[PDB]
Design a protein around this nucleic acid. Structure first.
Length: 184
RNA sequence: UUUUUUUUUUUUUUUUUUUUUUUUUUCUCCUCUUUUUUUUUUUU
C-alpha cells in the first residue's frame, strides 16, 4: 500500500474516474489529500479512485447528514443545540444549531409544543437540511421515526428509559414526563 | 309601490469589538553715601 500528498499523478481519465477528495486537470487525476490510496473496483470496471485518511479529527457538516447533539436551551419557538458527533465519530469542537417549531414531527404540523419535546440537557439524533443563515446556522430537523431524543436524563441524575412514543417514566420515583422518543 | 353588491390595522430578529492625567513659546533688565565691621562681662 502507498500513501498520498495533496498533488501527484494517479491515473488518466480513461484509466479510472475521480472519487472523493480528488481533482483532475489536463487529462490526469491529481491527489488532494495525504490519506491512503483506495480504488473501489465496485462492478463494471474502471474503479473510482479516491484517497481517504480514515482518521477524521474534524468534519464539516453537509446538506444531509446524521449528527448527535446536546440541547443547551429551549424556547417557545426554537431550541438551540450543540453539535457533538458527526454521525458516529467524536467531534473535536462544538458547532451550534436550531430546531424550529416545524421540524419536530414528520408532518410539519400545527400544535407540537416545543416545551415538552426537547428538554435541555438531553442528547438527540437529528439530520441537517441546510447551511442556514447568520442567526440560525445549521437548521437541523428531526422529522423522522428514527430521529429524536435517544438518551435522556432524569431530574436528579439517573439514566432515563423510553416508555412510549411520547411519554417516559422515572424508574425510582415513577414520575411521568414528555419527550420525543426515537426508535432504537 | 324603491330590490342586489362593493376584503383589511409592515413581514423580520438568537449582533463581534483587545484603552488611560496632560497636550503647544515671549527678550535683555544702574539696589544712593559716618565706617572699620561691633564682640569680655552679669542678671532669662
Amino acid at each position: 500500500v502507498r500513501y498520498c500528498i495533496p498533488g501527484e499523478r494517479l491515473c488518466n481519465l480513461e484509466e479510472g474516474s475521480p472519487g472523493s477528495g480528488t481533482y483532475t486537470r489536463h487529462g490526469y487525476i491529481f491527489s488532494s489529500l495525504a490519506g491512503c490510496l483506495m480504488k473501489s473496483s465496485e462492478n463494471g470496471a474502471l474503479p473510482v479512485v479516491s484517497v481517504v485518511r480514515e482518521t477524521e479529527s474534524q468534519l464539516l457538516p453537509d446538506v444531509g447528514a446524521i449528527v448527535t447533539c446536546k440541547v443547551s436551551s429551549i424556547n417557545s419557538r426554537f431550541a438551540k443545540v450543540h453539535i457533538l458527533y458527526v454521525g458516529s465519530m467524536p467531534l473535536k469542537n462544538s458547532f451550534r444549531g436550531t430546531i424550529r417549531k416545524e421540524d419536530v414531527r414528520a408532518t410539519e404540523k400545527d400544535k407540537v409544543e416545543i416545551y415538552k419535546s426537547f428538554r435541555p440537557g438531553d442528547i438527540v439524533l437529528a439530520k441537517v437540511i441546510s447551511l442556514g443563515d447568520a442567526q440560525s446556522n445549521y437548521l437541523l430537523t428531526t422529522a423522522e421515526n428514527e430521529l429524536g431524543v435517544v438518551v435522556a436524563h432524569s431530574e436528579s441524575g439517573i439514566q432515563m428509559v423510553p416508555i412510549s412514543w411520547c411519554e417516559m417514566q422515572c424508574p425510582k420515583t415513577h414520575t411521568k414526563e414528555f419527550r420525543k422518543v426515537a426508535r432504537v
